[PDB]
Amino acid sequence: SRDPASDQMQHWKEQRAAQKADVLTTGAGNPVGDKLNVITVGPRGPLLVQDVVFTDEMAHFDRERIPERVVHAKGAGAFGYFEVTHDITKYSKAKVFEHIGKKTPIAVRFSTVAGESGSADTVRDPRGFAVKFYTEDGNWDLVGNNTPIFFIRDPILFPSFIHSQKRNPQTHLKDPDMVWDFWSLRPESLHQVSFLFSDRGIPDGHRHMNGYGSHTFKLVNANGEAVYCKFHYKTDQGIKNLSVEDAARLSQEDPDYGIRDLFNAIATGKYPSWTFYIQVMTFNQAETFPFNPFDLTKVWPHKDYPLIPVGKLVLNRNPVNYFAEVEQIAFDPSNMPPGIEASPDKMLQGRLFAYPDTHRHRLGPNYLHIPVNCPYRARVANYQRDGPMCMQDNQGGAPNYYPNSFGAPEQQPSALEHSIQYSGEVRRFNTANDDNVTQVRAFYVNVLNEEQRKRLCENIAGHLKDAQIFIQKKAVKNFTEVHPDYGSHIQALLDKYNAE
Amino acid sequence: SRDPASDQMQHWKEQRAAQKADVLTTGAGNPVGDKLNVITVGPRGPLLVQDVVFTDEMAHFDRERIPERVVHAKGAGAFGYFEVTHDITKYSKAKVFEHIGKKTPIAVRFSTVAGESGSADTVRDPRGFAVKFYTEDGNWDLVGNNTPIFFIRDPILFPSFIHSQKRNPQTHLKDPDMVWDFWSLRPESLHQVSFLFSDRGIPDGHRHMNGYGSHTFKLVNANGEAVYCKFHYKTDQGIKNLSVEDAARLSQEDPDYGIRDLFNAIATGKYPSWTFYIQVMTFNQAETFPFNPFDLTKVWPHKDYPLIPVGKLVLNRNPVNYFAEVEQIAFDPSNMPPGIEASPDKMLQGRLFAYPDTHRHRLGPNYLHIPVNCPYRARVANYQRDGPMCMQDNQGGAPNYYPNSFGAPEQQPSALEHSIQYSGEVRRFNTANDDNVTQVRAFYVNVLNEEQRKRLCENIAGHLKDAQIFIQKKAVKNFTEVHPDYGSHIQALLDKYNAE
Amino acid sequence: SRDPASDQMQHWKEQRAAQKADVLTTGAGNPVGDKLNVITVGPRGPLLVQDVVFTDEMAHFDRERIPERVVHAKGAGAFGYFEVTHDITKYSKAKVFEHIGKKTPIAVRFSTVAGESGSADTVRDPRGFAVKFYTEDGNWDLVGNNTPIFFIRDPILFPSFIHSQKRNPQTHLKDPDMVWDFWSLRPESLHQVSFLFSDRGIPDGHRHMNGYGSHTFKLVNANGEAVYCKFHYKTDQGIKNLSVEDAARLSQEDPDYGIRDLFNAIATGKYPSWTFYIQVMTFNQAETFPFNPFDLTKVWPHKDYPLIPVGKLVLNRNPVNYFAEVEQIAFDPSNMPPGIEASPDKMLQGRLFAYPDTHRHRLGPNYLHIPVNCPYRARVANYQRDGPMCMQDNQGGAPNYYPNSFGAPEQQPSALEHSIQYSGEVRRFNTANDDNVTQVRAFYVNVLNEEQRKRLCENIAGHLKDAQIFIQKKAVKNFTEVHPDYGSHIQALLDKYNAE
Amino acid sequence: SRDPASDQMQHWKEQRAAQKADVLTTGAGNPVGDKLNVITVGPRGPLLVQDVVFTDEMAHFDRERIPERVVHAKGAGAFGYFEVTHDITKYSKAKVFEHIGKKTPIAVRFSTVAGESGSADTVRDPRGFAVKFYTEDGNWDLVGNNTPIFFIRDPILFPSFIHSQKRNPQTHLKDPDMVWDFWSLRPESLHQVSFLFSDRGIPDGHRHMNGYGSHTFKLVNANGEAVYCKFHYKTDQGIKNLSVEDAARLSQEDPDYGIRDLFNAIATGKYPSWTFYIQVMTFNQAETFPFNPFDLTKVWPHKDYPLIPVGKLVLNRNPVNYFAEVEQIAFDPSNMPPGIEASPDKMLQGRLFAYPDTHRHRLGPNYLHIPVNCPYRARVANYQRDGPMCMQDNQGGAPNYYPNSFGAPEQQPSALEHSIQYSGEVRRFNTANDDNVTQVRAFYVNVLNEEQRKRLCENIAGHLKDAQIFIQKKAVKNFTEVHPDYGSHIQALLDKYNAE
Numbered sequence A, B, C, D: 001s002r003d004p005a006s007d008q009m010q011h012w013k014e015q016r017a018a019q020k021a022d023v024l025t026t027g028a029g030n031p032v033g034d035k036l037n038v039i040t041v042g043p044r045g046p047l048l049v050q051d052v053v054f055t056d057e058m059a060h061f062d063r064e065r066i067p068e069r070v071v072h073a074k075g076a077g078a079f080g081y082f083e084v085t086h087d088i089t090k091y092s093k094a095k096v097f098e099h100i101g102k103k104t105p106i107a108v109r110f111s112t113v114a115g116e117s118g119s120a121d122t123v124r125d126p127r128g129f130a131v132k133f134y135t136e137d138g139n140w141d142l143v144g145n146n147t148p149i150f151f152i153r154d155p156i157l158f159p160s161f162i163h164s165q166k167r168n169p170q171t172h173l174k175d176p177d178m179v180w181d182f183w184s185l186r187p188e189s190l191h192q193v194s195f196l197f198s199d200r201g202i203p204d205g206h207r208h209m210n211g212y213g214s215h216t217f218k219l220v221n222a223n224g225e226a227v228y229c230k231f232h233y234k235t236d237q238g239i240k241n242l243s244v245e246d247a248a249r250l251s252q253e254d255p256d257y258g259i260r261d262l263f264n265a266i267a268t269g270k271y272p273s274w275t276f277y278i279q280v281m282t283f284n285q286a287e288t289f290p291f292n293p294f295d296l297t298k299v300w301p302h303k304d305y306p307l308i309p310v311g312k313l314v315l316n317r318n319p320v321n322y323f324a325e326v327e328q329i330a331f332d333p334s335n336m337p338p339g340i341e342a343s344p345d346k347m348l349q350g351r352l353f354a355y356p357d358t359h360r361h362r363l364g365p366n367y368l369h370i371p372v373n374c375p376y377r378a379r380v381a382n383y384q385r386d387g388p389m390c391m392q393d394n395q396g397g398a399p400n401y402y403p404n405s406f407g408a409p410e411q412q413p414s415a416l417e418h419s420i421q422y423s424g425e426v427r428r429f430n431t432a433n434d435d436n437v438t439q440v441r442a443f444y445v446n447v448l449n450e451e452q453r454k455r456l457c458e459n460i461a462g463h464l465k466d467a468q469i470f471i472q473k474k475a476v477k478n479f480t481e482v483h484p485d486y487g488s489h490i491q492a493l494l495d496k497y498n499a500e
């Protein structure tokens, strides 16, 4: 008996117990007489087309791969439930929050951002923490990160940001000039860059990190009154990080450390959990907040906006087939039930488009039919039909146009969205020069202690040293604007590296 | 009360009876408040991205279409059963034939060959008649036509043949020069061309035509002895044809005549049926047959090879959703259960490759998961995994490699294929100059009467008149080799047309 | 010598003249020794996998088809140029209008709306008239119809509208109940329905119809001042229509009448042309227009908004390969150069999303690389990379993130869009009960004469008679609201039909 | 000045020199005014659909990824030429070998086998070494490995083999039980397993390894006489390997070591080269060879079959865009010009099917149109048309059916394949119990010295220790059959590990 992950096949065999092996078939259910040799013209002659067993198997092997996710390609998944522990029905009418003790099944995927499918788990990166709630009002996807903020505040920069974090288009190598050119030109990134290069840049697996919705969302109650909120889901296992040295070692010894850790925890009954909270901001408070409350590079200070407990997330079930339940899972931030809505955060608005769009490419037009993606606790009834790999009844003979006089599905006025008046011209507004430094200073001065500040600067200088000097200079200038000691410490370390 | 096809929606409404309309949802199951107006900035302002209801619906509409079939694009489908009425277990051990009274569910699709999706039913063309038998040993697809023969006898000519029958690559028009250039250069086509231009070139809907497997197949019994066979399925409603004049009228008044006729027959309880027969030829008889018994341009004369009754096909159920059950159905001639095998017919051998191949393109890698294609009366267990739109459990945690020591599916030696010794070099053998005329003469002289012979020549000349004279001449020369009167009658009619 | 379309292959042969035939190759350029017979084990043995010539050809044949367009599937195309004849640079700074005599190459596709790829040209339907202008500021796609208006004024109804015009989801038949249920429930359709059932519902091929942009667009001049406009392109060959009887006959005798007519006109030097005009409306006039000037069911009366001549469209070149240049052409209304912009027409706004979206599905992510779609008179330089079937250099080693310090492409402030303030809440505003009848009455009373009014009512009643009585009644009620004689004439004809 | 790979962008900038930056455009060539901010309703309002610049860029980003290769996903590429140095025209009429000094352009891709796109270069694995020769008779793809043999000798086992080498289907972890269960059950693997776990299992980058065609091929001369051959391409830089300790370190410090090493070598003018040899075996020698000469687990001993020099491969050009020239390159073993043909090696026969098949999935039906895949030194002329992303002229108006009377391409009898008579039944022949040990013993005893034998056993035991004991036992039994010392050394090391 090794760890449960290592004993996967042995356990499968034992579960089968006395049962005879199934008969090996083709995809069309025809039994296979021999699957160890192909049909040839005599023992040393050529292969025949009529070996359809061979072609059937090989053609399917040839088509096994699908495009990886454009970001967050490397991941781990699990299933469990969300349980309401407190009443927030004064803020939201969403059915997922309807009453204390209400349990909703969930699916979760954890990931890194930049690495491809075959990359190591224990690298410095933000972590994805996506949660799908299968509610009676349809799926709610809260597609969070292990950070409350992000590097940029306008979505039209997101492809550029990702490109700068991935491989050089010619050499196919990671490129420090690209990374730091972009970040030095876009100092809105300082806040998340400070988080990334701190100790929480490398969590000790997925169970020891927090998640955040990051964006401001809108909650709407039964009386049609709205507030703004933030979602926080805090680890009940405690924050725990890997040192740079342990992370580097594990990246070679166990590239799949995060997958293995989660699988073994759940398989041995150590079910990880998170406490789910909201922060709430009224429309009036949004008018007077000193920054843009919809700016993704900003947090809401806890003193002014305390955490309000809502419930807990528990993961208690491993995937049975990774490809089916983790590779093919799709989260769309636009999947929000009545009672939860988007705010004007420009980044969130961009995400409302991007996710269904990429899913139609990565998975296919009918990706919502895939079992893990199905809103299986709701009844889907609409006027959508057809498309490739339509795997359901395609809504049978129901009338396929709306409005109609034949009793087909009808809109539900109670589900109408919340209306707001907005003031201004319709145009492109520059946000590059919003406050880039104030909350970063609070982090550097008040949240980090002295050891942490030192590791932060060493982590930064270790990466920034590989960029050209003109880039190093612009970057240090930005850190100086945060705090003269931040910049000067980094510059000192760079001097040492550049001397070598 | 009109015909059942016209009352489809009224019937759907009535079945619903008292029930309240379903709630209209997004694809993710979220209820929709209003699906008749989009979200705008004031009553005359631009559209917002956060109208995800709009985008969800429009994105799905945008992806509704899949590639049509490369041939046989226009079709009609129905479901029913096959019932064994006689014992042929001495010829075949296939479970579908196991005992008298055994019923197997079937799916059928009827089609024309050359026309696209929006083309008329009542045109001169061969008709497809594809039958899928859902057996306990997996699906058996008998992908037949309403003719026992075909235009060509080598599969490498099939793309050329189809191209010559479709549109000019520049003008996008049907092109008589292409059609008759090809047929005049390939006189193996004379036999099927004679069938096509006879009265049975335009059946009166799908219920009044025969089907044929066309190819020689191989039947293998429980003792491992093999014979060759042909499959014939003869209409119990009787042969009935449309005149050229009625067909032309219907092509404008009702392009969907065949679909409507079949749907209304089944909806009013007039279930069409076919009697299913085989012809049998022993290996010794195959050695002495005066032609190639595996030549698709040849029949087996009934005197020497009588029809042996096997059972009946009955269609008694209409599709509930056409797209799901007819557009997405896939038949592969290579889906043959134990007891039925391919013969060396070169055309059949080519089809063993082509159909799964086109299906992976038209439908997708996992097209066998689509419900209508699923071998739902068999248990599929194998080492195939993953691929796009994997809509099942993907065989869970089962071991995915063979051989293994963990109890996963095993080959079944009884399902091994039948072995034959073949003699000769492995090379390309010319078949262009096999007998092109003998069976055609028997058809023209002995099967057709005098009225039929006249209509045949008028039908040919009506089409051939549009080709250039050099093509008309080569074509007439080929008909003359069949019978001097065949050619001379055609030439007389051409003279009249070319004079005008 | 027949018509040029019929002599396509003969002409190709003659152009080749003395030249020896090319050597037949595989797709990989390897010469083919024999493409008329497959490789077998002796003359009557099975087919070998090592016949790669066979597999190469068959695999490509198997993948020839792409999804047809979801609407406007059946079409004809041609190439030519647009020439400026008058100066409108006071209204628009677009380079296509820059100076008198400036010629821009164009591509055009004509189509019907509802019919599939194999359907007849001479049917009652709106006609598409899409024009792609290859300008120095990129492609401008004016994706027009042969009508200035449309059936609906909100884009979220478009899928329903199209579904009601296509096949019943169960029977796969055209369904008058669906058509008239939808139109009777949505009387905004009365205006376009009146146009459709008039004589111009069936033009005599594509050369004898007008085109219209239909939507209000915005023109912006060099000083940044904006007006609203409509585009009209009026046939220089004159309006000409097919009678219902001639159209019905041609639908059987020549389903490709429109393709053939256009091809033969251009091949014999009868180059069709259109005169290109705008109507202009100032922002002040838009405030005082008695209807919504952005309502697609409304025209701008010519007395108040005269046609201003701009230039001419001439078609003088046939496609060389239909698939490459007509089937794969993609028009996106969102392709607008500086000086032309969208208006708030809700329908236009919906189209800005839908077309690139469907193109990524029908053609592929890199459909703009396809030669006919390429902006070949502009230089494309941006931060987009990769995607399937990347057929170019993928912009070589250029920096792939923006902003950057390495000299890669830069934004051009002069191309900034025009800013407007809008007033109101962000919500769904009902437009179902805008004026549905006033302009329709003007059409019925003042534009049509008495013979035309009679044919209109006969055309309507001929189609509406097949719907159920409750639908006939609601429809007649709507026509009555237009004019008591309109409704009563239709009702009289229906009485006769329903009596039979 | 760092290494050339690190200075990629700086070099690009400098090449541009004085030039003004290009204008940033959309994909349709329209200039972009501002690409740093999206269009919103006022500074804190929602995003508009009419920001088509945003949608265009984001939709393309969303579709950047294509499926990775099902095996050999992680790779490095380069370009150069092949030069003939000796005359082998007595063995082969292929134009690539036509005369001394003849240069043919080549493309090469190097890879590992099992790792995904984001995996480390310096891991134990076979290495791919694929060479595409762009000849005048079309492309020749020699899709080799850095080993002359492989793990299996029947292609129907290849999917199982690959599955056993990849991730557990439930846990998504690499699984030693899977690896060693398969290899212990299939002792034909002993030969390649011995190579893999020797020092050459981890080469020092791609320049310090040999390549081999591995399979027996057939060479055919101008007189139509055939021999069998093997292809060997031996590094001119010398064999050099990484120690297990250095490889492990580099896997964390530089996952892209192989890419970087090759790029920097070529960029600094150190062009790597290989000497290209054949071994030749006559048909008579094939009859008397003591093993199956077409068995992929066997070599031809050099004493009996000496290396015959042919020419040299030189790599002297880096990719300009990795995605376009390396990710999208496709090699098909079936691309063989006249003078080179397949042998009956069952593994090679399987590959003739699998590669074009997977390419149609990974890249698309028209993947041969992609510039790097194009046979750009040959003229492609055939009857293939259409398919998605047809990016060429689609062969214009040429006749699209064969045979034809209009002067379109013609077969070339000189390119006919070589004919052979084969003897036996057409059936599945078992090869599991061919000689699994004799050549492995020669390797262990005569090729490896004593230090090498020790490292071999340590490398094996280090991996095998993680499998269950029953698997360890079966594996050791197989090594014992090779040589009692091989097995006993491994068993000794296992005892130590299992004790811990």
Ligand code: HEM
Binding pocket: B068, B069, B070, B071, B072, B075, B109, B110, B111, B127, B128, B129, B130, B143, B144, B145, B150, B154, B155, B156, B158, B212, B213, B214, B215, B329, B330, B331, B347, B348, B350, B351, B354, B355, B358, B359, B362, C062
């Ligand atoms: C070498 C010869 C042939 C080749 C390469 C070939 C290939 C094809 C292909 C690629 C399709 C489209 C399949 C799909 O997308 O689902 C098709 C359909 C069809 N073929 Fe064949 N075919 C050949 C000969 C024949 C023959 C001889 C028959 C009848 C005996 C036949 C009957 C049909 C029918 C009935 C369909 C439509 C099946 C359906 O309803 O989905 N074909 N063929």
